[PDB]
Design an enzyme around this catalytic site. Sequence first.
Site, mmCIF file in Angstrom:
data_model
loop_
_atom_site.group_PDB
_atom_site.id
_atom_site.type_symbol
_atom_site.label_atom_id
_atom_site.label_comp_id
_atom_site.label_asym_id
_atom_site.label_seq_id
_atom_site.Cartn_x
_atom_site.Cartn_y
_atom_site.Cartn_z
ATOM 1 N N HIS A 1 0.651 -1.340 0.143
ATOM 2 C CA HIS A 1 -0.089 -0.010 -0.041
ATOM 3 C C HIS A 1 0.879 1.243 0.086
ATOM 4 O O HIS A 1 0.218 2.411 -0.099
ATOM 5 C CB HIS A 1 -0.969 0.034 1.218
ATOM 6 C CG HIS A 1 -2.046 -1.191 1.089
ATOM 7 N ND1 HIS A 1 -2.996 -1.119 0.346
ATOM 8 C CD2 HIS A 1 -2.240 -2.169 1.881
ATOM 9 C CE1 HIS A 1 -3.652 -2.342 0.544
ATOM 10 N NE2 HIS A 1 -3.344 -2.785 1.693
ATOM 11 N N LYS B 1 -5.906 -9.717 -7.889
ATOM 12 C CA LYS B 1 -6.398 -9.372 -7.115
ATOM 13 C C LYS B 1 -7.367 -8.096 -7.523
ATOM 14 O O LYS B 1 -7.036 -7.130 -8.145
ATOM 15 C CB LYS B 1 -5.497 -8.570 -5.963
ATOM 16 C CG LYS B 1 -6.285 -8.247 -4.451
ATOM 17 C CD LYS B 1 -5.432 -7.876 -3.302
ATOM 18 C CE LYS B 1 -6.093 -7.895 -2.241
ATOM 19 N NZ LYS B 1 -7.265 -6.867 -2.234
ATOM 20 N N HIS C 1 -3.375 -3.037 7.636
ATOM 21 C CA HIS C 1 -4.081 -3.689 6.419
ATOM 22 C C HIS C 1 -5.090 -2.566 5.911
ATOM 23 O O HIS C 1 -5.158 -1.298 6.608
ATOM 24 C CB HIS C 1 -5.245 -4.322 7.044
ATOM 25 C CG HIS C 1 -6.046 -5.270 6.064
ATOM 26 N ND1 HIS C 1 -5.673 -6.550 5.503
ATOM 27 C CD2 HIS C 1 -7.253 -5.554 5.475
ATOM 28 C CE1 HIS C 1 -6.375 -7.342 4.725
ATOM 29 N NE2 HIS C 1 -7.336 -6.432 4.581
HETATM 30 ZN ZN LIG Z 1 -9.048 -7.129 3.472
#
Ligand SMILES: [Zn+2]
Lengths: 118, 118
Positions: free
Chosen positions: A11, A38, A111
Amino acid sequence: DSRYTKFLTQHYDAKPKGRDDRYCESMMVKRKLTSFCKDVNTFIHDTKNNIKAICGKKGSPYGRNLRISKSHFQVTTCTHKGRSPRPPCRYRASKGFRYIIIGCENGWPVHFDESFIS
Amino acid sequence: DSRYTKFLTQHYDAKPKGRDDRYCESMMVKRKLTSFCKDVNTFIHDTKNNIKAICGKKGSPYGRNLRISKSHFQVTTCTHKGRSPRPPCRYRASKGFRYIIIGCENGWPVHFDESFIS
Ligand SMILES: [Zn+2]
Ligand SMILES: [Zn+2]
């Protein structure tokens, strides 16, 4: 920190090479997210310090294990645009400047919540 | 048709049991999408005939290998709401009635495009 490093791999991209569809297609491969295609993944263009601060007082609780940023972040969200889940994977890029929701563990980002914010 | 059957497993649910967060959490498991916590997945509440028709004259080309439906569909989009990619996986449900984009192969639905439509 293993989960923090994994989060950064998935990220974090401070100086993105273009923020277009090609950027997404290249980065999804470079950051190891294309074993299957993904469907959604967001890259954040800001400092590690600023992202981490979301897990502290610069975030607000957003339901269990989630925090929403108090500040807007430059982001590029890559979404799968193909019919096959097998690489090579084609992507569209969507640039944004918005609040972001992250999952936190012991003060560290672990996350990224990929759901819609308006 | 293997890829069509896989699509149905992942995306077809004619009579959904409630369309809430619990529905998403249960269905993501039942339909085998939680080996890791898949971040986004949409269940379509309509007939197989109506969904398949998107790959024919009741869809419009939407870029390579994609078609956008000419008709609105009742849907429930499940998005991951946790900090961990390991099951058990927690989800939020978002109900919608909207046009949907699917990936088609030889007249059959084989993929669901999970990007934002407005
Ligand atoms: Zn997730
Ligand atoms: Zn996909």
